Amino acid sequence: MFTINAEVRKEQGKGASRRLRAANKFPAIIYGGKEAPLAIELDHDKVMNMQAKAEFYSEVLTIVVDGKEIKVKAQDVQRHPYKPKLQHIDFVRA
Amino acid sequence: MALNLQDKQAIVAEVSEVAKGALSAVVADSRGVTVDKMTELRKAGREAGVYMRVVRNTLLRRAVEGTPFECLKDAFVGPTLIAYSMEHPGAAARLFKEFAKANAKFEVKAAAFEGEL
Amino acid sequence: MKVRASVKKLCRNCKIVKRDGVIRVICSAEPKHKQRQG
């Protein structure tokens, strides 16, 4: 029941990822199955309110990006140590 | 304060008794003490308390929303405080006189006796 | 009245409104709770 509006990452690496946190974005990745992994960027203000509910980690979510809808599940979420922020979220196809 | 679903408990209980109702009587409970309310409670002690009311549906967006079905006397009743009461039994007998004869003690406010069916 | 530093709201009658460049603590019911310098 969850719709995540996202875009495909043009740039990559440490220098690229820190520029996204200045613009209220954060890096991510959708992997699993026979398909190759793809680096995706998510908006912080929209996503940060969702994982407060317990249904985010249990129920299946649908990441909308360029008219795809991969339909993935949450695996591992890296948080920023000394603030309430998100660093990187792993996704698995299902 | 209760939300829309829980508010309908007071509405549907009043709306069903519009067609089936018999008599109603009003009084100003404003400026009044709980001991002045206890006079009507000990009046209902013979009748067991379930039959009688004075149960305040007195908001203009609660009881006056359930009035427009049938028997509209609440056009000019609106302003100030009103004590709504509805009974399935009941005659047009002495029940008015207890409120009238109590006016020796003043009874705080009687709402100038507006009157109901 | 004390000065100390932190205002610390104790009772329901506590006010906490700024006057000139230095905020004060005003309490009508309890004059002991009056404070400055926060």
């Binding site: 949450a74 948080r79 000394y82 | - | -």
Partner: protein, 136 residues
């Protein structure tokens, strides 16, 4: 109080406090206390902060200690000259990074737990913050 029983070596030189902390989440407890700032925390501070948490909610609720000093930290005398070896061991210190969970709490309500951590926050030299369960 709260020091090593035995030590492999008596003295540590000095050391640096760099990088970020290890435990981003609370493993054992339901709530806890995280340190935002950076600095040296002596063994007397965590003893004093624990004494506030010892008597706050009486019997109900349990507390854990996720930190420990294990750093000798020598101190010289006053009128002595420089050199003539290193000073003797006086008090123990826990070096901690930003994002380290110092204390934890389980069997206390949410609103009551904020009061307990507020008292322990003033005992510590650096700024601190509240944390949730954070399962994943």
């Amino acid at each position: 109080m709260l020091q090593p029983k035995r030590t492999k070596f008596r003295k540590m030189h000095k050391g640096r406090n760099r990088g970020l902390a290890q435990g981003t989440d609370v493993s054992f407890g339901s709530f806890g206390l995280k340190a935002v700032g950076r600095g040296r925390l002596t063994a007397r501070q965590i003893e004093a902060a624990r004494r506030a948490m010892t008597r706050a909610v009486k019997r109900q609720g349990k507390i854990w200690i996720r930190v420990f000093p294990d750093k000798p930290i020598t101190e010289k005398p006053l009128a002595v000259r420089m050199g003539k070896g290193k000073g003797n061991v006086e008090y123990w210190v826990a070096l901690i990074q930003p994002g380290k969970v110092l204390y934890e709490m389980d069997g206390v309500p949410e609103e009551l737990a904020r009061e307990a951590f507020k008292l322990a926050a003033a005992k510590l030299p650096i700024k601190t913050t509240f944390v949730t369960k954070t399962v994943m």
